[PDB]
Design a protein around this ligand. Structure first.
Ligand SMILES: Nc1ncnc2c1ncn2[C@@H]1O[C@H](COP(=O)(O)OP(=O)(O)OP(=O)(O)O)[C@@H](O)[C@H]1O
Ligand SMILES: Nc1ncnc2c1ncn2[C@@H]1O[C@H](COP(=O)(O)OP(=O)(O)O)[C@@H](O)[C@H]1O
Ligand SMILES: [Mg+2]
Ligand SMILES: [Mg+2]
Lengths: 39, 486, 15, 35, 470, 187, 105
């Protein structure tokens, strides 16, 4: 039960990361806002 | 997250010549863009020589190198007991992260002249030969030196297993926390060692720092200092630690690789000029603190593999000069049946009787004198039947005491039973018995004293000495068992 | 909040 | 240095080997004839 | 992928300048405009977008400015059951004239060693049928063995006898890696494997894969062919769960190959003229030859010991990577005893009473002790002579010489060297025979009755025949 | 003789000749003039016939230094530039000259306070946020420096922007964040 | 030319650092202007390291080195039977040339 839980949650964590790679001017603007927030 | 960086000018053999990084410190930990770590060993006018904590195939010319602003440090604390870690303290046994709270720099200086007190408390190994003839004290640096496959790791593992009697008790003054740094060994050898320590229930008070043969040279270089810091944590907090570097020859080889690749001037056997400085600043950290500093201690048991018994090599010479004594192992003694194959003539402990209990002192002074006389007249064996009765008596007592020192593997003895056995030996109660039975007797007798004579053993253990009542009771027990022995 | 998009939208995706 | 004299070769190790072989070929002769 | 140009050719070292796309270290580059495939493995980034590389074949006929193409990966060799019965070189080309090796997957010859949590502590004795090995330093299933010896003491004969016995008794896809050895021995082994049925040129049920880079190869090929064979064995272990045998002969050459390029890579020599990176290279290679929880790899490695030193950095560094070392001695081979295994220098980590049983362990320790006592008595024998020894000591010397002869054994592969027949002694027979010699049960028999016999019954029969003759 | 060391250091033959010239020119307060003349002399050197004549190894250094001397006199250089070219020709470091030149150039590149800084992005970003980042970054500077931007474009970072301000380096890219929190979810 | 032809940068102890020779191969036989032969063993960015098959007394700085285009090779066959030759196959037994039809690397 543990080993099946380990292989699975491992196959989950690399899925969900690989599945947003498939997925923004708001960010580019937010970056300069953060660079201003650096001070 | 604004970081000062540099470019990798070149990379090769685990050395990265890095541009920029104008404010990096000497021996500062940097981080490459691929996630790898490195240490700045050479600060040169136009570049920085970084040693890579890993595989250089992930580093390319032009990669960004960030600073971290910190000298290398490792987690320390009691949360490391029972764990197998790498040279940087990361758990490698898959039991989750190390929940430590404190971090300690691996390159801290040793205690000075004043924070120390003399080495006076015994560090029991459980090996009769060591505890009687080459006594080790808490705060000492005793070298285990010998050829390959002569039984050095076995001495370290017996010393680690033996501390279970003290770590399961309630006397907090006698508890010893063990640390086994494994440099340049196979991962399967370390797994066998960890399994052996778990079976003996010795892991709960032991840390195993593992920088194995496939780890980069900087990691094998750094592992002894990480282990020494983990032990300095205990030494500083009123507790007592023991550390075993297995072995320092491989750390010297790793440091020589790093130096030769950094183009540092080579010396004898291509070792850099500061390899003595390396081992000496590692070994001076094993100290015994005075009560004003908590009374803690750190005992170092460095291991050295000599080639063909040549103790005049470079690194053996250095570490023999640094330490407070040596336990020398011989392969000829090994195959003669003398195991542990300790060479008593060459072994030495410059602490000596100041690291023994009074009972072991009592029996061990006699045993040492008798074995010395035996070593003097031992060449006259093969002719013994044609000399005086005194020479034949010297030879007889010598071989009896020699067989008295043989001991099985992974079976360390309590100090009381060692004292009882050496008492039966050096008092003459084995002269009438012939040699081929001594070992057997030593077993049976032991069982006897363990079964029906817990009072005498407990009284010796509590007093630390053999008083006249203890002496007489031991006398009667020995003579009774000997008269009734097969 | 790119990862925070990830963390919720993907655990939801696994759910 | 237990077999140092015959591991070094030389006259003292070549004479030891010859003496051993002499004695034991004698004994193997006086052991075979008694079979 | 990316293209560069040769800018320097010194020996087996080639510098390549890439304008765009510098390849990572350990990548394989192909030189353009050559008859045969020449591969350069990247070793260093020199700065100024130039890489230093080691050539896998000869560098003759190379021109400055010649085009070099980046493959984007290390040397990738074909792996799979199709490699069984085939011979490939360091870069995976078939060198048996039997056509291409149509596997379905390729593996890079550079990989990471198995982690610590992937190690297995199982120790199970592997009985070889050889008296001295099984008695004093027995091999374990899934362990690393190693055979040490100078030039001409019998490493190849012993590794071929091990091949014979174990591999023909095995069912797990052996793999042989010839690393910088004689090509004549490679052809010999190939044909004595074909004629033994272990390699089948038809009806492909072959059970051995061969990888060969011999003495005539450049230093790079001799340094990477061990990794190639290792990668074949690693595929058989991981992606198939099988239990693999991995024979390597000779592994010293691997080390030596590195030295032959070290100074040309711009590295200060270490001691005895060896690369500064000796121990770590040996580590990253040997730590991949291991049994994991996913499979098992029993590895026998012939280790050349230069000039019978055993303290040279190469054998001395190899010693700590093995589980059961077998050290062959010239002083023993000159006595006529074969195999020349040194009983007082061989070691096994399963020579433990809790593993081999107290009887096996006690017999082994008694044999070693009587041999050490014989050593100690030979000095007295040189000075006094034999007639002035004690009687207990004459008995010691007699039993010691008898044990020396009985450790000898006729091999099936040495039938031409000896004219004798091959003998495969079981384990219990070995323990029983040596116990009986140590007990005195054969004091009446001569010592030449134990020379080159199998079980002790053969010693008795040989003594009876030697007497019936004279 | 005390030197006037530049703000940034270059090493090698390039750095030695460039530091020698910088300290020379700072004593007579002619840095801008020497800089212009070095630009011009480098562009002269890149001439094909002159490059073929100065890189040639079998040409005697006497005729080579005479050629460089008179071709220096054909432009009416400063005594500092003339003496530098004569020193490079007399020592046989003419092949390194442009390096030296650029060294001095980069030296003065920091004397004018010009701080180099590159912004790598995924897709080529337009000028509005470019002036925005110009203004917000010139806050990162000390007394009197001006930005030298090089907006580079690699979509392998698939978002965010990696900003290298001189030797400072901020990683606002999305790949680094994804990998960081992925590691955190794995470790 | 500087592709099929180079110029000796320096000569000493039987080693010639040669300029140019951009198309020379590794282990190729080159020919100096004096009639001597050499082998290109070090292909370096700025020069070629030629080992001279003879006495470097006749080689001077500035000499012209030409290519042969052929990696070093010697005559073979049965005509060599009975002859005494030097390392390059030239007869030294004073019996005239060797009628070899084949050359082998
Ligand atoms: N007291 C003993 N009694 C019997 N056998 C022993 C004893 N001590 C060690 N041995 C055996 O001798 C062998 C070598 O001992 P050990 O490996 O501990 O020494 P080592 O110097 O660390 O070897 P290495 O060269 O691999 O580092 C082991 O197989 C061990 O089981
Ligand atoms: N088991 C053996 N039986 C008989 N002769 C042997 C045996 N082993 C080695 N020899 C002899 O020693 C010689 C060397 O054998 P070899 O396998 O080539 O040793 P190595 O591999 O160390 O060079 C053999 O030709 C053979 O004559
Ligand atoms: Mg050990
Ligand atoms: Mg061989």
């Amino acid at each position: 039960q543990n080993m099946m839980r380990r292989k699975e949650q491992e196959h989950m964590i690399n899925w969900v990361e690989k599945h947003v790679v498939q997925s923004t001017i708001a960010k580019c603007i937010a970056d300069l806002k953060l660079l201003a927030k650096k001070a | 997250d604004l970081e000062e960086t540099g470019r990798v000018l070149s990379i090769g053999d685990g050395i990265a010549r890095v541009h920029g990084l104008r404010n990096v410190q000497a021996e500062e930990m940097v981080e490459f863009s691929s996630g790898l770590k490195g240490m700045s060993l050479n600060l040169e006018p136009d570049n920085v020589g970084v040693v890579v904590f890993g595989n250089d195939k992930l580093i390319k010319e032009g990669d960004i190198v960030k600073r971290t602003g910190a000298i290398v440090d490792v987690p320390v604390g009691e949360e490391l007991l029972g764990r197998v870690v790498d040279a940087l303290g990361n758990a490698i046994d898959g039991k989750g992260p190390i929940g430590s709270k404190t971090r300690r720099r691996v390159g801290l200086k040793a205690p000075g002249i004043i924070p120390r007190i003399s080495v006076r408390e015994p560090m029991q190994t459980g090996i009769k030969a060591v505890d009687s003839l080459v006594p080790i004290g808490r705060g000492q640096r005793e070298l285990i030196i010998g050829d390959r496959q002569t039984g050095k790791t076995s001495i370290a593992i017996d010393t680690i297993i033996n501390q279970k009697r003290f770590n399961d008790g309630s006397d907090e003054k006698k508890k010893l926390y063990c640390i086994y740094v494994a440099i340049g060994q196979k991962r399967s050898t370390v797994a066998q060692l960890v399994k052996r320590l778990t079976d003996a229930d010795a892991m709960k008070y032991t840390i195993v720092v593992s920088a194995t043969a496939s780890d980069a040279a900087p990691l094998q270089y750094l592992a002894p200092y990480s282990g020494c810091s983990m032990g300095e944590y205990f030494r500083d907090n009123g507790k007592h630690a023991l550390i075993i570097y297995d072995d320092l020859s491989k750390q010297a080889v790793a440091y020589r690789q790093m130096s030769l690749l950094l183009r540092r001037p080579p010396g004898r056997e291509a070792y850099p000029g500061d390899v003595f400085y390396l081992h000496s600043r590692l070994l001076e950290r094993a100290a015994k603190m005075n009560d004003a500093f908590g009374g803690g201690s750190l005992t170092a048991l460095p291991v050295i593999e000599t080639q063909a018994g040549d103790v005049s090599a470079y690194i053996p010479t250095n570490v023999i000069s640094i330490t407070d004594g040596q336990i020398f192992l011989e392969t000829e003694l090994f195959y003669k049946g003398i195991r542990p194959a300790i060479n008593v003539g060459l072994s030495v402990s410059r602490v000596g009787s100041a690291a023994q209990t009074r009972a072991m002192k009592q029996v061990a002074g006699t045993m040492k004198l008798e074995l010395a006389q035996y070593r003097e007249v031992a060449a006259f064996a093969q002719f013994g039947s044609d000399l005086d009765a005194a020479t034949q008596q010297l030879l007889s007592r010598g071989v009896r005491l020699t067989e008295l020192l043989k001991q099985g593997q992974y079976s360390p003895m309590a100090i009381e039973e060692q004292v009882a056995v050496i008492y039966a030996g050096v008092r003459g109660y084995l002269d009438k018995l012939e040699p081929s039975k001594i070992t057997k007797f030593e077993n049976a007798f032991l069982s006897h004293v363990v079964s029906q004579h817990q009072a005498l053993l407990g009284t010796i253990r509590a007093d630390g000495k053999i008083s006249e009542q203890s002496d007489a009771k031991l006398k009667e027990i020995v003579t009774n068992f000997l008269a009734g022995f097969e | 909040q790119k990862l925070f998009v990830d963390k919720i939208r993907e655990y939801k995706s696994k759910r | 240095g237990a077999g140092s004299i015959r591991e070094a070769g030389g006259a003292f190790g070549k004479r030891e080997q010859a003496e051993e072989e002499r004695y034991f070929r004698a004994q193997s002769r006086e052991q075979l004839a008694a079979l | 992928a990316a293209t560069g140009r040769i800018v320097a050719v010194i020996g087996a070292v080639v510098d390549v300048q890439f304008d765009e796309g510098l390849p990572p270290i350990l990548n394989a580059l192909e030189v353009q405009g050559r008859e045969t495939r020449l591969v350069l493995e990247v070793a260093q980034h020199l700065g100024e977008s130039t890489v230093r590389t080691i050539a896998m074949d000869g560098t003759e006929g190379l021109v400055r400015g010649q085009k070099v193409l980046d493959s984007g990966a290390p040397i990738k060799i074909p792996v799979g059951p199709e490699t069984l019965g085939r011979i490939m070189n360091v870069i995976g080309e078939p060198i048996d004239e039997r056509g291409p090796i149509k596997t379905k997957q390729f593996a890079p010859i550079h990989a990471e060693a198995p982690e610590f949590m992937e190690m297995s502590v199982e120790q199970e004795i592997l009985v070889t049928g050889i008296k001295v090995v099984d008695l004093l330093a027995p091999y374990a299933k899934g362990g690393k063995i190693g055979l040490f010896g100078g030039a001409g003491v019998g490493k190849t004969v012993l590794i071929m006898e091990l091949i014979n016995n174990v591999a023909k008794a095995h069912g797990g896809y052996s793999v042989f890696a010839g690393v910088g050895e004689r090509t004549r021995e490679g052809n010999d082994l190939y044909h004595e494997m074909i004629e033994s049925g272990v390699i089948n040129l038809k009806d492909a049920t072959s059970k051995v894969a061969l990888v060969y880079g011999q003495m005539n190869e450049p230093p790079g090929a001799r340094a990477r062919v061990a990794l190639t064979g290792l990668t074949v064995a690693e595929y058989f272990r991981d992606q198939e769960g099988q239990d693999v045998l991995l024979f390597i002969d000779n592994i010293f050459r691997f080390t030596q190959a590195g030295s032959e390029v070290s100074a040309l890579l711009g590295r200060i020599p270490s001691a005895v003229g060896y690369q500064p990176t000796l121990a770590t290279d040996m580590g990253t290679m040997q730590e991949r030859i291991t049994t994991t929880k996913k499979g098992s790899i029993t590895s026998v490695q012939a280790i050349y010991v230069p000039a019978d030193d055993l303290t040279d950095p190469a054998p001395a560094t190899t010693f700590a990577h093995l589980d059961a070392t077998t050290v062959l001695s010239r002083a023993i081979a000159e006595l006529g005893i074969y195999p020349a295994v040194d009983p007082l220098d061989s070691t096994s980590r399963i020579m433990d009473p809790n593993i081999v049983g107290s009887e096996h362990y006690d017999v082994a320790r008694g044999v070693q002790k009587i041999l050490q006592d014989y050593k100690s008595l030979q000095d007295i024998i040189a000075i006094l002579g034999m007639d002035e020894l004690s009687e207990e000591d004459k008995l010691t010397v007699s039993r010691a010489r008898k044990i020396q002869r009985f450790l000898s054994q006729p091999f099936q592969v040495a039938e031409v060297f000896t004219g004798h027949m091959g003998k495969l002694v079981p384990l219990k027979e070995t323990i029983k025979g040596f116990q009986q010699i140590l007990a005195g049960e054969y004091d009446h028999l001569p010592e030449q009755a134990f020379y080159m016999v199998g079980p002790i019954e053969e010693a008795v029969a040989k003594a009876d025949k030697l007497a019936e003759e004279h | 003789a005390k030197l006037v060391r530049p703000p940034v250091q270059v090493y090698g033959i390039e750095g030695r000749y460039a530091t020698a010239l910088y300290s020379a020119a700072s004593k007579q307060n002619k840095l801008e003039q020497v800089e212009k003349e070095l630009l011009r002399v480098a562009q002269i050197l890149k001439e094909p016939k002159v490059a073929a004549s100065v890189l040639n190894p079998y040409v005697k250094r006497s005729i080579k230094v005479k050629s460089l001397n008179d071709i220096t006199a054909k432009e009416r250089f400063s005594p500092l530039t003339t003496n530098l070219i004569n020193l490079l020709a007399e020592n046989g470091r003419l092949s390194n000259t442009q390096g030296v030149v650029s060294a001095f150039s980069t030296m003065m590149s920091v004397h004018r306070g010009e701080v180099p800084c590159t912004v790598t992005s995924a897709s080529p970003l337009e000028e509005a946020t470019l002036s925005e980042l110009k203004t917000v970054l010139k806050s990162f500077l000390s007394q009197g420096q001006v930005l030298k931007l090089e907006a580079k474009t690699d979509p392998s970072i698939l978002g965010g922007m990696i900003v290298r301000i001189g030797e400072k380096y901020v990683d606002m890219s999305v790949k680094t964040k994804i990998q960081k929190l992925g590691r955190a979810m794995r470790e």
